[PDB]
């Protein structure tokens, strides 16, 4: 979930993109555009929610660095650009949030505590 924290008057559009596991990082808008993406409008709604689905080979994935089971990429691009009226500060910020879903589960209890 991305929450925009800029002037009410400020407007623009951005493209939040998702590239499924194994695929190369989308480095261009056009590239990122082809895959699962949301076209998040700043002007209207302040908060975007992109639910990353379950596009996984194994029924259970590695929490560790593995190429057999590697995540993917979530990237944001300038769909349009940022438009600010009058002399309002031209630089604002965006916060990000992450959470799980009802179908999210875990297994094999392990630890990592040092001294």
């Amino acid at each position, epitope marked *: 979930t991305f929450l925009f924290c800029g002037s009410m008057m400020a407007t623009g559009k951005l493209l939040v993109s998702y590239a499924p596991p194994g695929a190369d*990082p989308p480095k261009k808008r056009k590239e990122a555009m082809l895959g699962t993406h949301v076209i998040w409008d700043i002007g209207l709604q302040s908060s975007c929610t992109m639910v990353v689905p379950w596009i996984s080979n194994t029924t259970y994935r590695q929490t560790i660095d593995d*190429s057999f089971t590697e995540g993917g*990429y979530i990237s944001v691009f300038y769909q349009t650009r940022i438009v600010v009226p009058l002399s309002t500060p031209r630089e604002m910020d965006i916060l990000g949030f992450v959470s799980a879903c009802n179908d999210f589960s875990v297994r094999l209890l392990r630890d990592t505590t040092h001294i």
Partner: nanobody
Amino acid sequence: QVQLQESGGGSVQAGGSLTLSCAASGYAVSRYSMGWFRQAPGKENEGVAAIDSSGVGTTYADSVKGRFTISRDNAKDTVYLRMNSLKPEDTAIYYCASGFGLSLSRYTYAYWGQGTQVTVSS
């Protein structure tokens, strides 16, 4: 733990060429790219040069374009930032970062070096 050892810094002359390098531990350098970020005394996080190990597709910042040269080594897991023809504006504490990849953006990276101070003495 992924380590990036920022090596190749110092106080050279205006126009004085100075190469940079970073030893990339903890991962296969090919899965990542590698770039450079400078920050002038009391200024901001600004980009300079970055390329992806696999595609070796170059990308420089507009102000540094020409004079700076980035090049990767997949054998020694090191990057080479040939900062040739330096200028008094290139006096900014440099930093290297492995990318997801690929290009000079705000931050867009994750592993950051300690920071090497280069001063384009004039």
